[PDB]
Structures are given as structure tokens and as C-alpha cells.
Amino acid sequence: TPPQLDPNTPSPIFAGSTGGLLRKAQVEEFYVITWNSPKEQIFEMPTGGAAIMREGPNLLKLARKEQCLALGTRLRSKYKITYQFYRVFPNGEVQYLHPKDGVYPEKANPGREGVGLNMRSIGKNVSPIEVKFTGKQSYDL
């Protein structure tokens, strides 16, 4: 799938709180989650309190990926809404984060490369004495 863009999406109606962004967002990174709602309704923010999502496209800024994924999974489970989130850097780079292939990870998709596979039982790992004085680890072999 080709990554999308989020040029000028508006934001939900919130009154403000103390659970928002901090110095890390200005210094290190933050995250942006965008979705589409068919009607105006009230949802619960991960940072505390309740907000109202405008009908149409909605955009939100958060601090960590866990909050974004929790909000997205709540939206999918309760409202049946498609969502996607990116990560934003101080220099202006925007990196597409949620589904990279265009399909959800729980669904098998052809053309996916396998990482971290060991073709043996968990009890076939070598003893730590065999890998001593080397930079490798037993489970890495």
C-alpha cells in the first residue's frame, strides 16, 4: 500500500487537560492518529476525560504509540471505524506507522518477510558455556 498524507484535518472538541504533550514532543517525537467518523459522538480520551468527535475526518496528537493503538483498537471494537497513525519527528519527517501492507497484522498476507524465526524447539538451544567469550547469545543462534 502507498502511505497517505494528513494535510489539514481538523481536531475533536476538547476542553484541555494536563495529560497532554510534554517536552519530549518538542525534543524527540510525537504521534498522530487520523480516522473517519460517520456521525458526531462522544468518546473517551486515553489521557483522561471525554471528547466529542466531529463528523467526517478527525485528527489527534498523542505522546506514545501505546495510546494511539489503544484508541484505535477501542474505535475498531466499539464504533467499527478505520484508523491509521504516523510518527512525527522534530525535523518535520512524517513516517507511516499503522498498517504498512494496507491490511491488519492479524490477517495473513502474501509477500510478507519473516523476522526472528528459529526452526527448532525451545529446548534445543545450546548451553551458555558454548557461547562464552563471544558477542553472540544462545537464542540468537
Partner 1 sequence: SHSVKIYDTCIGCTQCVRACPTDVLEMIPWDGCKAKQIASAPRTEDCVGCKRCESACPTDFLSVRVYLWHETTRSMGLAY
Partner 2 sequence: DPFIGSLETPVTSSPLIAWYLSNLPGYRTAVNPLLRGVEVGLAHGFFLVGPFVKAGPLRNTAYAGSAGSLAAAGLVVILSMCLTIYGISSFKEGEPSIAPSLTLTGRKKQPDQLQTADGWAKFTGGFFFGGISGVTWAYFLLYV
Partner 3 sequence: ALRFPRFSQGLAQDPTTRRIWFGIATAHDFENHDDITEERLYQNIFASHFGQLAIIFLWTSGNLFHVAWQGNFEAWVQDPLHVRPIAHAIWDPHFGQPAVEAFTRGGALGPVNIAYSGVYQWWYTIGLRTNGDLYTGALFLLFLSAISLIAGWLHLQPKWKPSVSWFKNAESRLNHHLSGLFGVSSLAWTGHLVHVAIPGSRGEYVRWNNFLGVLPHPQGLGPLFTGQWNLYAQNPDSSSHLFGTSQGTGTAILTLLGGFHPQTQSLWLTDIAHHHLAIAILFLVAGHMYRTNFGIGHSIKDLLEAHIPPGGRLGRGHRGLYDTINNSIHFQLGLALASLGVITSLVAQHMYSLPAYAFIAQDFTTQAALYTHHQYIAGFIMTGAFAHGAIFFIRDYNPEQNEDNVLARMLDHKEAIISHLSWASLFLGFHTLGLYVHNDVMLAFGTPEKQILIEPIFAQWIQSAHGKTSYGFDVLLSSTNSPAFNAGRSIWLPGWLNAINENSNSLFLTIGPGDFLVHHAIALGLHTTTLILVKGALDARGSKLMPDKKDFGYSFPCDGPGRGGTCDISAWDAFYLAVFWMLNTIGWVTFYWHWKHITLWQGNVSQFNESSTYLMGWLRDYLWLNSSQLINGYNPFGMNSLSVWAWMFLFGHLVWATGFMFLISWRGYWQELIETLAWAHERTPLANLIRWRDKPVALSIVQARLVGLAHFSVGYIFTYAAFLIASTSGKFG
Binding site for partner 1 (CB under 8 A): 22-24, 28, 63-66, 69-70, 97-98, 105-110, 112-123, 137, 139-140
| Partner whose binding site includes residue 14, from partner 3, partner 1, partner 2, none (CB under 5 to 8 Å by kind) | partner 2
Residue 133 contacts partner 3 per CB under 8 A: yes
Of 4-12, 48-56, 100-108, 128-136: span binding partner 3 (CB under 8 A): 128-136
Question: Where in 17-56 is the site for partner 2 (CB under 8 A)?
Answer: 17-22
> Which residues make beta-bridge pairs with 32?
61, 86
CA quadruple 126, 131, 135, 136: dihedral, nearest 10 = -10
Instruction: Quote the CA–CA distance of 49 and 4 in Å, as a whole number.
Output: 30
CA 132 to chain centre: 38
